[PDB]
Design a protein around this ligand. Structure first.
Ligand code: HEM
Ligand code: HEM
Ligand code: HEM
Ligand code: HEM
Ligand code: HEM
Ligand code: HEM
Lengths: 140, 140, 140, 140, 140, 140, 140, 140, 140, 140
């Protein structure tokens, strides 16, 4: 009797994450990333460079917390077509939603010039992703 | 006693999706796609090209979220003649409705010249397809 | 005790479909098809040709949704003489009513010159066929 | 306790069909068939010919829906002497009443010159034959 | 407790059929047959001939619905001395009362010159024979 | 292990009957029947007549031993496609091959004017039909 | 251990039938049918006509022994992709190969004007179809 | 112990089909199809037309025996990565290799203008596809 | 006792594929792809274009048969650290090695300008990938 | 009796890897990496840059195939003190030896300026690491 509630909660979390991903919120380019994080890129001699860390909070921006937008929305699309009545599908898509966040900007690696990335800890996407990952945590 | 409710819900979702697909809503050609998505095709040197991304929301338009109209309506027709009292048919047609959405427009691939495509995240078709995919998620 | 209700519902749906097929409703020749679908056939160079698509809804007219009238009415006649108390007969005749709809008009294939075809998504036949296919979806 | 009701219903349906067959209703020769169905036989070049279809309803007249009167009344006579308490006899005589309807008039095959035929979808015989075929659909 | 009722009903039906057969009702010679059926015999070239059919109801007169009076009354006499408490006797004598009706007059075969025949569908014998054949349809 | 031998024997008998029916042997019209049977038709007063019996052997020609050629060859065709590993199919097609023989010529009924009939006791067809009917007599 | 042999025999029979159907052998139009069967079509008054029967063997040509070439080769193609290890597939495709033979030429119905038909008892196709129908007759 | 042999045979058949598909053999365009099949396209009045059938062998070319080359080679690629130790995968990929053959050229529908098609009954591909479909027929 | 052999075979196939991937064989850029496949890219007006197909073999080059080299070698690295004694790991890494091949060049989509891709049907990599995918097909 | 052999093989592989890691073989800095891989770093505008790929083999150098030397030798030290008689320890340390290889040089990320990295596919370390990962693949 709890599997139905688990399925409904999973679907609701996926739909809310999809609603916010459609509007594009939580997606950053180089400009928005370096502006909102306060990280300034200095291009030392000659082919490398580095970000100037001013507060430790910026370290969150340099963690494994970025995913490709197309990959993430495709993951949502394919997840909506799963048998969440089963524990196996829940485990698999939970691991998929957890592992999709990879690092892109680092202390010595500048944010990509033209690509966009999805921030795991964006103020709007963070609660949705947290509730989504928590919705799979229901066993029988 | 829940299999009957699952069957009725599945049939209702299929009927609603069919009702909206008959009117052609959610179907895009190159003109309507590039108009509603805001994506402008620039023809870089020389035989290729790319879409100009102005907001990250447009990434949803470039995901795996497009299906052939004839294939989709034939899928609906053939799905309406299944024994949804069985779990096997539910799983199979759920996978069919989930995998019918493939990518067609990409960052370096312009929308097809003359063909039409069905948008998974069209404002009208999105809730119907979501409810349809969720209706199969009922096990015994 | 539900098999009796399933049998009665199946028989009623078959009888209603028969009543509307007898009156000839939902049957199209080349003239009526090209008139009601708005598809105009242009005879391009030189021995072939194509239909001019003006709205995407017309794609439903070009799907696998056409059946021979005599074949369909014979299917109904022979189906009325089945043991629908059994699940096997229900499954078999459901598959028969689902697979009888084949494609005939296409974008590059004109509607047959003299034959008649039954439209799966005719405004009158659509609910009858839907209710018929749903009546077989009852198991024990 | 339902086998008695099934037997009584089967016998009542057979008796009603017999009552209407005794009066000769639903029997057509070439003249009455081609007059009441509106099908006009045109003798194309040179030794053959075809019926001219003016409305699609006429297709019902060209289906597998004709039986020999003597064969049908003999089937009724022999059916009245069966043990309908058994499911096997019900199934067998249901198949017999279903297979007695064969095609005689076709698009390229004219109605027989002198014989008479019984119309499965005659306005009077249709409900009786339908109820008869449905009366056998009772299991225990 | 139902076998006694079945036996009593069978005996009552046999007694009623016997009562009407004793009076000779439902027995026809060539004169009475050709008078009551309206069938007129024309002697075509040269040693044969045929009946002139004026209405299709007459076809019932030419079916397998005729029995020898002596054979039928002997069948009744011997049937009254059976153990109808058993299902076997019921089945056997039901088949005997069903198979006694054979064809004798046909479209191209005139009624026998001097013999008498019993008409299965005589207005008086029809309900009695029907009720008799139906009385055997009782199992335990 | 005996059902395989029974199946092979049944198929061989059906094939032999088919081979001899293809050549048309054992098929009679009025001329060949009245010539080979020695029965002479005298046209007594006035529209009827009778055959003049000269030897009692001719009585075999007047028994229930005639079948329509097309019906018989169709019976063979459909019988070749049965599951004779099962007892049910063997019993059913045995009864079908036994009941197809009906009477046509009688002492007071001349052979049909234009039709053909198959003689059950034709010198060639008799052993084939006998072996066929005997091949089904194998049970477990 | 016998199911493997049954499967191999079924596949071999289907392959041989396909090999001979590819070359078109056993396929007849009106000219070849009326030439090889000896049946001469006389166009009686006025839009109909009849075949002149000279020997009873010709009745085989007028039986239910004709199939559409495209339908038959499609049946073979789809049958080659079945699980013949199962009895169900064997029974079903045996019934399909048995029922594909329908009547087309009759005594009062001339061979179709332009279509082609496959002769069930053609000298080359007869043994292949017989062996095919017999190969399915293996149960456990 | 037989599942290993079945798997090896399946893999060998898939590899052989891939070997011949890589070289492109058995693939036809409009030119090669109309040249090797002998079918000549006449452009009747006015926007349609038809193929002129000169021998019945050409009917094989007009059956459901054509597949897209890219779809077929992708099917082979994905099939090579299955767990053929299981019966389910064997059944599924057998159905996939059986259903990939669809009709494209018809009597009134010319071969596609620019596309290519794979001929199920090409002299080289026919035995390979037959052996492939037959290799899956191994159960326990 | 067969799981050890299965593990050893899997490891040997992975090591051979790794040996050939280290040398870079089977990797193509735009130049090598368009040179070895014979496909010539024409840049029609204005932002799109197409490849000119000269033989059907080239269709293999346009299928879903390309993988990123880094992704493929990382897949090999991670696969070498699995518990192939278990069936689950075998199934998972088999599906991973089967699904890693995606399409990149198409008829209307030119090969990427600067990236490299791994050809599934390269003359050297094809047997190794086939043997690798077949090595996982061993169950207990 | 196989767990002892598995333990001995695991310990031997760890000892061989340790023997080669002590001598420092397979460890690269920026100079040795860019010398042995042939990858030349070009400093595009302005603070970033990229490696110039001349042959596809170099892609192996840019995969997830690098580990910190101290982390790897500490992993070996701590692994030598495990209870490899248990399956759990084998699985865990196998995953540890598989996941220690991470990417460090990328197409747009130059090799670290002063740190050292251990190359998974070094000519000497490759067989040792492969045999080590394979030694854990023994279950009971
Ligand atoms: C018992 C649990 C089973 C599960 C979880 C299962 C799962 C699946 C899945 C995931 C598919 C793919 C559907 C798609 O790609 O759209 C499928 C297809 C299929 N399965 Fe099963 N299956 C089961 C049992 C069976 C069995 C026992 C049979 C046959 C004996 C069977 C027959 C088929 C067939 C014929 C298809 C192909 C349907 C199509 O045309 O796409 N299934 N099944
Ligand atoms: C137990 C589960 C069974 C299932 C799910 C099943 C399913 C099917 C299906 C899907 C068809 C095809 C219907 C069509 O294409 O219109 C069919 C046909 C058929 N089956 Fe079964 N079947 C079962 C058992 C059996 C058995 C055990 C037998 C015989 C011993 C049988 C006899 C037949 C026959 C004779 C047909 C042909 C019906 C026709 O003429 O169209 N079935 N069945
Ligand atoms: C147990 C399940 C059985 C089923 C589902 C079954 C089914 C059928 C069917 C479908 C027919 C064809 C009826 C027609 O074509 O109108 C038939 C006929 C027949 N069956 Fe069975 N049968 C069963 C048992 C048996 C058995 C065990 C026997 C004999 C030992 C038997 C004897 C016959 C006979 C004699 C006929 C011929 C009826 C006629 O003349 O039309 N049946 N049965
Ligand atoms: C158990 C189920 C049985 C059934 C369904 C059955 C069925 C039949 C049928 C259909 C007839 C032919 C009736 C007619 O043509 O008028 C008959 C006659 C007969 N049966 Fe049975 N039978 C059964 C058992 C038996 C047994 C076990 C015996 C003997 C040990 C037996 C002895 C006879 C006899 C002697 C006749 C001849 C009746 C006559 O002279 O007309 N029956 N039965
Ligand atoms: C018992 C039967 C099982 C079957 C038939 C099965 C089937 C599958 C399939 C088809 C995949 C997809 C692999 C891919 O897409 O590459 C998968 C992945 C996976 N399964 Fe299972 N599974 C089973 C048991 C389990 C169990 C019991 C667990 C965990 C308790 C599990 C954990 C996983 C995980 C973590 C993945 C993700 C692998 C990846 O990263 O791609 N599996 N499984
Ligand atoms: C019975 C089957 C079991 C399996 C297949 C299994 C599998 C695994 C796996 C895959 C890891 C990850 C290793 C890594 O990331 O390097 C792990 C770690 C671990 N497991 Fe298990 N486990 C099992 C049972 C248990 C149980 C019952 C316990 C404790 C009661 C346990 C205690 C641990 C611990 C403490 C770790 C952390 C090791 C570390 O420091 O990385 N395991 N196990």
């Amino acid at each position: 009797r709890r599997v139905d509630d688990a399925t409904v909660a999973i679907r609701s979390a996926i739909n809310n994450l999809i609603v916010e991903l459609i509007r594009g919120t939580g997606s950053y380019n180089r400009s928005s990333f370096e502006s909102s994080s306060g990280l300034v890129w200095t291009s030392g001699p000659a082919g490398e460079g580095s970000y100037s860390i001013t507060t430790p909070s910026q370290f969150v921006f340099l963690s494994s917390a970025w995913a490709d937008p197309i990959e993430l929305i495709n993951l949502c699309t394919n997840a909506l077509g799963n048998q969440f009545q089963t524990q196996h599908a829940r485990t698999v898509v939970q691991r998929q939603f957890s592992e999709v966040w990879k690092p892109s900007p680092q202390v010595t690696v500048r944010f990509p010039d033209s690509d966009f990335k999805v921030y795991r800890y964006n103020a709007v996407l963070d609660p949705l992703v947290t509730a989504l990952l928590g919705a799979f945590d229901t066993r029988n």
